[PDB]
Amino acid sequence: EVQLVESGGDLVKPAGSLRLSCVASGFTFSSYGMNWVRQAPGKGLQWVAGVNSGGFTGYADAVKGRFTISRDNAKNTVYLQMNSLTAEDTAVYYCAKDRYYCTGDYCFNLIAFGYWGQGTLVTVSS
Amino acid sequence: GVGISTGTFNNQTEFKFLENGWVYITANSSRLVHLNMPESENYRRVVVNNLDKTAVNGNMALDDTHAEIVTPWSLVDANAWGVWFNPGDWQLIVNTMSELHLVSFEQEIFNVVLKTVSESATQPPTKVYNNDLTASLMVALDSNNTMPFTPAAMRSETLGFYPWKPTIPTPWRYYFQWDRTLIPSHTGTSGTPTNIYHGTDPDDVQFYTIENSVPVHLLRTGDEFATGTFFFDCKPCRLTHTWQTNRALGLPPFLNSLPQSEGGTNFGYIGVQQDKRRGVTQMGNTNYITEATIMRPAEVGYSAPYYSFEASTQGPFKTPIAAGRGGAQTDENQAADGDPRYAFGRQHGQKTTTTGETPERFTYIAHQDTGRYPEGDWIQNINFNLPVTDDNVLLPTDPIGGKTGINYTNIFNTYGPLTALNNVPPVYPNGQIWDKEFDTDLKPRLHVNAPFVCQNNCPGQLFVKVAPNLTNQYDPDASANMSRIVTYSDFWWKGKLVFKAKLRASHTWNPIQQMSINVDNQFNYVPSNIGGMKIVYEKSQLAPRKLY
Amino acid sequence: GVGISTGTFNNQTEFKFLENGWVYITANSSRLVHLNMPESENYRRVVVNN
Amino acid sequence: SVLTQPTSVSGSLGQRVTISCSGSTNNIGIVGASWYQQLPGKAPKLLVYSDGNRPSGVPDRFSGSNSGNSATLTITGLQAEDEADYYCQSFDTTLGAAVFGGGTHLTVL
């Protein structure tokens, strides 16, 4: 069955950078897009970014231009470099995989589904 | 002479090139063959009747009942790819060649050794193997194709795929005629529907014997037998695949408004209201012209009542289909019908250092998209008022006969005068190379088992046997089993298969897909530390080609 | 003549095989070149010193 | 962009209950809602696809519907274990971004 794992969340000073990592197994990592979704303590959900198989990336305006997402298809691993962090970015981050195989620029990063991982916590303060 | 050799071992592959981009591929294969004496010398008529298994309602598909003649002869079959080409040679052929022809076939038996066994029966066990210089190996080349054609690939009973591992021949048998009935059921039917075996009707009885039909050559430890070159008459095979389905045939529609920036959402637009489009369609009672409704020259691929089982005099069989699902390349769980599944053992690929009777299996997902995706089909009433209401469309989700898991697509066939479909791709190494054309008045367009099918006739089978090594107590009037000296024969086998192939040409700006060694598949082409080998399946139609 | 073309465009990469496993590779390459007049009709001897 | 949801909802044990989500033509009117459930402190798990189907192992209790610019989720045979926060999800076709709703808390009485 599909399994995802995440790591890299930690308490960090404002500004600077932080780099998350999510790993996958049980499914053909190449054929599926990967997405990060975040939720602040007690608050609602907010999609962060997604990366289709070809290296094409998508971001939400709250991070567009600040974060950079990527993949390593040879290791079923996805990375999220979070540069220029601010206090508002304090949240829990989850790793997801869309239901329907998809690749290329015109490919919707996330439609419906994902075996969300346990997630990693991130806090920005000093 | 007993002490003289009669042949040379040669398992080389040669690519002699010619003018106009053709290459003559001569594939030489040699093997050490090991043959015991047959369990008995008599032709046995035997019947299999798995009544216990099939009596359980809903297991009719598991029917195995049949009738066969078990002969004292063994069959040497080299009609499989791995017998001839190693992974590297296959890489070369599939990556550099576009089409492949079949030219000729030879084989010979040389260096026949016959040995006899004596067991001491002493309290510490021991035995001795002794030569029998006057013992003979019976060889019979059925050049006229008089015996029933029995290609060993279907059972994974062909010669082996490694030159350095000796191989055995397969005990030869052929089908008798049985009339058998089996009314299908389900887990829920009452009692037990008829599961009856009727026997043989005298008008279909055919008892063949090698002895009465083919010359037999009696090779002693210093003799040799060479079949003689045969020449084929098959049609060419293609090493390139087609992607164009019906939606991709012809001129796209002009896009009156095009994207202005790169972006996943920056689509294009045809730009004209659908009821206002110029074009040609077969749907004469609508003005909507759409990619789903625009005329195309013909149909690529066809739909069939998949997993249909059809009954005849000999029992149910699965209605074979030419090609499998479309888009199954991305998910093994959707292999479904059409795409073959091979089960085989340590002679023919399975990691030679594996214990047990479980066979390695793979399903061969083809590269050509002459297939179908049944979940997306729909039949809608002729009026074609849109959007369609519940009653005017039959969907792949609707019941047939009230069975919630049987939809109309399971009993559906769309084959017609317009079907364009392709031949099956070769499967390395467990695939078959050639097959005989049925002796029927009207003949099938293709065989699902082999790429090359034979027009007039093609190569005769080779049957081997160990001569009766009688003891001195023989008595033809005895009703008991004939007392034989335990004897067995090891003979070398060499074959030559000549192919003709064409060298491909780059037709497009972009690179095409190729078979390549990589950090994932690496250890499939080198022996294990304790010396075990394997052959993994390889594609054969990576390069795309233009259908239209 | 002014109104007559003096050549033909061609990219085609042509593979032609010979005997003994050799192949001729003829690579045709055709471009349209664009040439403005030089900044100065004179040669210049120049030093750069960063 | 964002999808509207009710703040909270209540239902008695064994009764049926309904939850609603609202959007626009480019998020719900094109791609249906997908409903998620989140247990206290755990990662959310989906309940109903936009396809209308449910993942393997999801109780038959849940079911979803869609109408115009809005969607709706219902629970039949409400149980004590169903007390959790719920979220609608869609895809804004214009921005090309997944849009998640404001969330709703269901109370079991």
Side-chain angles (χ1 to χ4, degrees), chain D residues 12 17 39 51 61-62 64 79 84 93:
Chain D
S12 301
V17 66
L39 296 175
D51 191 26
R61 301 202 286 283
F62 307 96
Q79 295 299 312
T93 311

Side-chain angles (χ1 to χ4, degrees), chain A residues 2 14 17 20-21 40 49 53 58 63 65 67-68 71 82-83 85-86 89 95 98 119 124:
Chain A
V2 175
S17 64
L20 309 185
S21 305
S53 308
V63 303
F67 296 2
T68 54
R71 306 168 60 117
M82 301 187 300
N83 304 326
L85 282 160
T86 68
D89 300 312
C95 186
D98 203 15
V124 182

Side-chain angles (χ1 to χ4, degrees), chain A residues 5-10 12 18-22 35-41 44-49 62-63 66-67 69 80-96 116-124, chain D residues 38 43-44:
Chain A
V5 179
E6 304 102 324
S7 64
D10 199 2
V12 65
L18 190 65
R19 191 181 181 95
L20 309 185
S21 305
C22 158
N35 300 268
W36 288 84
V37 185
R38 75 180 180 176
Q39 182 183 23
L45 305 169
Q46 180 175 73
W47 170 73
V48 180
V63 303
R66 292 201 294 137
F67 296 2
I69 187 173
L80 181 68
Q81 179 77 22
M82 301 187 300
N83 304 326
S84 303
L85 282 160
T86 68
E88 294 81 4
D89 300 312
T90 296
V92 179
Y93 289 63
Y94 303 96
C95 186
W116 290 36
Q118 299 194 354
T120 192
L121 173 64
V122 180
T123 299
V124 182
Chain D
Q38 183 170 30

